[PDB]
Amino acid sequence: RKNVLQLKLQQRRTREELVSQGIMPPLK
Amino acid sequence: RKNVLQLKLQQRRTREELVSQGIMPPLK
Amino acid sequence: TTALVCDNGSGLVKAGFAGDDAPRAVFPSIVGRPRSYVGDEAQSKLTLKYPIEHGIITNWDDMEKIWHHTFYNELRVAPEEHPTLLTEAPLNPKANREKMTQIMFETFNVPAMYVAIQAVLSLYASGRTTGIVLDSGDGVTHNVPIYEGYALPHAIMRLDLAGRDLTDYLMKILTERGYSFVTTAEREIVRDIKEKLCYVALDFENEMATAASSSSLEKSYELPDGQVITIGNERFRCPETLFQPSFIGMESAGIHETTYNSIMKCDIDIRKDLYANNVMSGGTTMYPGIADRMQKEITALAPSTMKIKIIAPPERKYSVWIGGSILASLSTFQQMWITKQEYDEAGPSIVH
Amino acid sequence: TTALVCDNGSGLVKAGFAGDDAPRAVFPSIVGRPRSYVGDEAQSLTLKYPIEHGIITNWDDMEKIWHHTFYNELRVAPEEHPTLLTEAPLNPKANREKMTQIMFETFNVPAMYVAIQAVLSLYASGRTTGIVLDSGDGVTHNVPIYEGYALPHAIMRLDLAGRDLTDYLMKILTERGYSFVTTAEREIVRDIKEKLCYVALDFENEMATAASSSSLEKSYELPDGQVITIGNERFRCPETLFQPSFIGMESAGIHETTYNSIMKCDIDIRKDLYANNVMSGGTTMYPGIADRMQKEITALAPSTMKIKIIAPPERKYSVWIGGSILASLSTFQQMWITKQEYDEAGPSIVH
Numbered sequence: 001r002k003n004v005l006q007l008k009l010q011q012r013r014t015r016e017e018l019v020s021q022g023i024m025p026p027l028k
Numbered sequence: 029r030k031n032v033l034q035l036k037l038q039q040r041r042t043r044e045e046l047v048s049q050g051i052m053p054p055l056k
Numbered sequence: 057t058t059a060l061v062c063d064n065g066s067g068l069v070k071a072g073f074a075g076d077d078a079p080r081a082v083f084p085s086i087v088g089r090p091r092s093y094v095g096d097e098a099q100s101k102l103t104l105k106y107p108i109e110h111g112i113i114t115n116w117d118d119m120e121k122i123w124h125h126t127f128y129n130e131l132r133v134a135p136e137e138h139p140t141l142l143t144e145a146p147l148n149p150k151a152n153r154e155k156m157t158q159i160m161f162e163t164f165n166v167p168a169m170y171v172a173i174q175a176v177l178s179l180y181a182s183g184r185t186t187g188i189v190l191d192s193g194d195g196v197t198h199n200v201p202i203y204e205g206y207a208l209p210h211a212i213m214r215l216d217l218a219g220r221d222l223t224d225y226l227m228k229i230l231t232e233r234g235y236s237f238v239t240t241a242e243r244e245i246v247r248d249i250k251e252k253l254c255y256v257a258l259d260f261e262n263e264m265a266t267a268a269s270s271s272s273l274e275k276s277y278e279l280p281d282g283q284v285i286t287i288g289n290e291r292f293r294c295p296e297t298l299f300q301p302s303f304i305g306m307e308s309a310g311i312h313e314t315t316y317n318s319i320m321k322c323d324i325d326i327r328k329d330l331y332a333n334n335v336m337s338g339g340t341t342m343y344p345g346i347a348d349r350m351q352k353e354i355t356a357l358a359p360s361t362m363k364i365k366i367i368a369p370p371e372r373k374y375s376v377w378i379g380g381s382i383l384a385s386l387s388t389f390q391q392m393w394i395t396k397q398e399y400d401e402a403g404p405s406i407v408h
Numbered sequence: 409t410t411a412l413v414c415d416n417g418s419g420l421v422k423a424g425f426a427g428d429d430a431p432r433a434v435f436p437s438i439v440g441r442p443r444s445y446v447g448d449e450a451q452s453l454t455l456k457y458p459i460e461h462g463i464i465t466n467w468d469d470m471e472k473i474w475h476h477t478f479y480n481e482l483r484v485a486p487e488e489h490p491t492l493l494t495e496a497p498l499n500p501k502a503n504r505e506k507m508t509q510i511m512f513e514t515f516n517v518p519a520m521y522v523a524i525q526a527v528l529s530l531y532a533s534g535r536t537t538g539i540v541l542d543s544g545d546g547v548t549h550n551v552p553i554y555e556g557y558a559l560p561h562a563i564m565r566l567d568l569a570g571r572d573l574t575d576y577l578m579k580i581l582t583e584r585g586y587s588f589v590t591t592a593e594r595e596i597v598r599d600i601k602e603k604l605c606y607v608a609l610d611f612e613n614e615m616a617t618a619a620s621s622s623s624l625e626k627s628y629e630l631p632d633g634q635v636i637t638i639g640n641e642r643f644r645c646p647e648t649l650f651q652p653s654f655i656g657m658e659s660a661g662i663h664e665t666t667y668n669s670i671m672k673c674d675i676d677i678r679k680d681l682y683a684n685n686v687m688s689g690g691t692t693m694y695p696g697i698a699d700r701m702q703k704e705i706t707a708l709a710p711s712t713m714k715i716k717i718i719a720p721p722e723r724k725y726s727v728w729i730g731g732s733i734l735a736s737l738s739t740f741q742q743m744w745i746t747k748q749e750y751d752e753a754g755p756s757i758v759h
C-alpha cells in the first residue's frame with residue numbers, strides 16, 4: 001500500500017534542519 | 029530556592045527559535 | 057483496540073478505524089434540537105445546528121454530542137479503549153486544539169490521541185510528503201504547502217468560501233430561469249443539482265458565449281415532485297465562483313491565485329516541488345474540469361520553464377480520512393500518540 | 409516515589425533524591441574483583457573504573473555500579489522511582505541508547521532522563537546562560553549554554569583532569585626524593601594534591617619566588633607519621649591545566665579552550681558567556697584557579713568586555729545539585745521518558 005509513505009517519512013529532514021535551511025519559520 | 033531557575037526556564041526561547049537566529053546548529 | 061480516525065468536517069464527519077481503506081461512518085455534522093439527536097438521526101428532520109464553522113469547532117457542547125455519537129452509535133466502540141486521531145483545519149487556534157485535547161482525555165478518557173492537519177493527511181494519502189494541497193470542503197478552502205512532511209504555516213492561504221456557499225449561490229442563480237429554491241430542504245435538492253450537474257469551465261467567457269448561442273450545454277434534472285427542470289450556464293457560473301469570488305460579493309483572490317500566493321510565500325528552492333505536486337482534496341474539488349482549469353491558470357502564473365502537475369484522486373472527498381488511516385496504521389507513528397499519562401503531567405499544552 | 413539523581417563520574421558516583429540539598433551517597437566509581445565488590449566495599453587489589461574520561465566504557469561493571477547505587481547506597485527499588493542520570497558532553501549516541509536500554513530493561517525504571525553534566529552545574533547557579541568549565545577526575549570540558557541549551561558545536565574537550573594531575577604530582581615529588589608509585593601511594597598523593605596544591609597567578613614569578621625563598625613550602629604528614637615538605641610542586645602540578653605540555657600533551661590549556669569555545673559561538677552571545685563563567689568539578693577546587701582564569705581570559709577577550717568567574721563552594725557537587733533542582737521542578741515532570749514511551753520507540757527515544 002502507501003508503504004511508500006513510510007519510506008519517505010524516514011528520509012525526512014528535522015524541523016530544525018529546515019529552520020536552519022531557511023525553509024520553515026521557527027515557532028515562538 | 030532556584031525559583032530563579034524555574035522563572036528563567038519558562039522565559040526561554042525555542043530550540044527552533046535559536047537555530048533560526050543562527051545561535052544553535054540544527055539537530056540532524 | 058486499534059486506533060480510531062475521525063475527520064471533523066463543517067459538513068460531514070468521516071470516522072472509522074485505522075487500517076481501513078475507507079471510513080466506516082459518514083454522517084452530516086449537525087445536531088438537532090427539540091423545537092436531542094445527532095447526525096443521520098437528526099436528518100429526520102427541528103433546528104439543525106452546525107458545530108463546526110469554516111473548519112473551526114465553534115459550539116463545544118454540540119461537538120461533544122457529535123463525538124459521543126461517533127463513538128457510541130456509529131463506531132460502536134468504547135473511547136477509553138482506542139487511541140483517537142482527530143483532524144483540524146489549518147491554522148486552527150491554539151486554545152481550540154487545547155480544548156479538543158482536554159475534552160478527549162477528560163470527558164471521553166481516551167487512552168491517547170493525536171491531532172493532524174487535514175491537508176497534511178490528504179498529501180500523505182497520495183503517497184507524498186512534499187506538495188501544496190488545495191483542500192476545499194463544505195465550510196472552508198485552504199492552500200497548504202508542505203515540505204518533507206511539515207505544513208508551512210506562514211504560507212497557508214484561507215478562502216472562506218466552499219461547498220455551502222456554492223450551493224447558496226446556485227439557489228440564487230436558479231431563480232433567473234424561474235425556479236425557486238429557498239428553504240433548508242430545497243437547498244438540499246440544490247446541493248444535489250450542484251454535485252450532479254455543475255462543472256468548471258476551462259475558459260469562462262467562451263463557455264458563456266457558447267451557452268448564449270447554443271443549447272448544447274443544457275441539462276435537465278428530476279426533482280422529488282418529480283418535475284423536470286433544465287439548466288444551462290448556471291452549471292458553470294456556480295463553481296466559477298472559486299476562481300472569481302466577486303461573483304458572490306467577496307474581495308478574495310480565487311483558488312488559482314491563492315495557490316500561486318501560497319507558493320510565493322515559500323522558499324524559492326522548494327517551489328518547483330510544490331508546482332509539481334498540487335494535490336486537490338475535499339468534496340468541492342469534485343467538479344469536472346476543475347483540475348484542467350487549475351493547470352491552465354497556474355501555468356499562466358508560474359515560470360515558463362516550470363513543471364505543473366495537478367493530482368486529483370477519485371477518493372478525494374475522503375483523502376483526509378484515508379491519510380489519517382494510513383498515518384495512524386504506521387508502526388513508526390505509534391510513538392507520536394499523546395497518551396493519557398503524558399496529559400496528566402502537562403495538561404492541554406502537550407498538544408503542541 | 410521521589411525522583412533519584414545519579415551523577416556518573418569517572419572517579420565518584422554521586423547519588424540521592426531530588427529535592428535534597430546534597431547527594432545522599434558519594435562513593436568511588438570502582439568495581440573490584442579479587443585474585444565483585446562495588447565502591448566502598450571495594451577499597452577495603454583489582455579495581456576497575458567503568459567510566460573513562462566521562463564515557464561509560466565497561467557496561468557489565470556499570471550495571472553493578474548502578475545496582476549498588478539503588479539497592480545498597482540509596483536503599484530503593486528502581487521500578488519505583490523516576491531516575492535522572494548524567495552524562496558527559498559529546499557522549500556518543502549508541503552510549504546514551506545503551507544507558508537507556510539498561511535502565512529500562514535491566515532495572516525496570518518507570519521513567520528516566522539523561523542530562524549533560526555541565527548544563528546542571530549551570531542550573532545549580534541559578535543561570536540558564538553561561539559557559540561552564542567542568543573539570544573532574546577523568547575529563548575537562550567547556551560547554552557554552554544559551555537559554556538552557558548546550559551548544560554542542562562549541563564544546564571543547566581537554567582530556568586531562570584530576571587523575572592525571574595526581575599522577576603528575578607523583579612524578580615531581582621524586583625531585584625531592586619522595587617515591588610515590590603504587591595505587592595506595594597515589595591515594596596519599598591525591599590527598600596531598602587536595603590539601604596543598606594551588607594555581608599560581610603568574611607561573612614564572614611563582615617559580616622564582618620558590619627558588620629564592622622558602623616561603624612557599626608546606627609540610628604534610630603521611631599515614632606512617634613521617635613528614636615531607638613540598639614547594640614548587642604545589643603549583644607546578646595544577647599549572648598543567650594551563651600548560652598541558654607539562655605532561656607531554658599538545659592541547660590548548662583551559663584558558664585557551666574557554667576562549668576557543670566562546671569564539672565558536674554566535675558573536676551576539678559572547679558578552680553573556682564572558683560574564684558567566686561557571687567553574688564546576690573537583691579539579692576546579694584549587695585555590696587561585698578562579699583568579700588565574702580571570703586574568704587569563706581578560707588577556708584574550710575584547711578590552712571593554714566584562715569577565716566574571718563563578719565558583720560555588722559546593723562545586724564538587726553542582727552537577728548533582730543541578731539534577732536535584734531540575735528533577736524537582738513541576739514543569740520538568742513532563743520531560744521524563746516513561747517506560748510506556750520506551751516500549752513504543754526503543755532506546756532512540758532518549759534523543
Ligand SMILES: Nc1ncnc2c1ncn2[C@@H]1O[C@H](COP(=O)(O)OP(=O)(O)OP(=O)(O)O)[C@@H](O)[C@H]1O
Binds near residue numbers: 219251339
Ligand atoms: N461531486 C461533487 N461535486 C461538487 N461538490 C461536491 C461533490 N460531492 C460533494 N461535494 C460538496 O462537498 C462538500 C462536502 O465536502 P467535504 O466532506 O470535503 O467537506 P467537509 O470536510 O465537511 O468541510 P470542511 O473541510 O470545509 O470543514 C459538500 O458541500 C458537498 O456538496
Ligand SMILES: Nc1ncnc2c1ncn2[C@@H]1O[C@H](COP(=O)(O)OP(=O)(O)OP(=O)(O)O)[C@@H](O)[C@H]1O
Binds near residue numbers: 419544548569689
Ligand atoms: N580540593 C580539591 N583540590 C583539587 N582537587 C580536588 C579537590 N577535591 C577533589 N579534587 C579532585 O576531583 C576529582 C574528583 O572530582 P569529581 O567528582 O568532580 O570528578 P568526577 O565527577 O568523578 O569525574 P569526571 O567528571 O571527570 O567523569 C578527583 O581527582 C579529586 O582528587
Ligand SMILES: C/C1=C/C(=O)O[C@@H]2C[C@@H](CC[C@H](C)/C=C\CC1)O[C@@](O)([C@@H]1CSC(=O)N1)C2
Binds near residue numbers: 086
Ligand atoms: C447527503 C449529504 C451530503 C452533505 O454533504 O451534507 C453536509 C451536511 C448537511 C447537513 C444538513 C442536511 C439536511 C443533512 C444531510 C445531507 C447529507 O448540510 C450540507 O448538505 C450543507 C447544506 S447545502 C451544502 O452544500 N452544505 C452539507
Ligand SMILES: C/C1=C/C(=O)O[C@@H]2C[C@@H](CC[C@H](C)/C=C\CC1)O[C@@](O)([C@@H]1CSC(=O)N1)C2
Binds near residue numbers: 420435436571572
Ligand atoms: C576519597 C576518595 C576520593 C576520590 O576522588 O576517589 C576517586 C575514585 C578513586 C578509586 C580508588 C580509591 C583507592 C578509592 C577511594 C577514594 C575515594 O580513585 C581516585 O582516587 C583516582 C585515583 S588518584 C585520583 O586523583 N583519582 C578518584
Ligand SMILES: [Ca+2]
Binds near residue numbers: 065376
Ligand atoms: Ca474537510
Ligand SMILES: [Ca+2]
Binds near residue numbers: 416418544545
Ligand atoms: Ca563529574
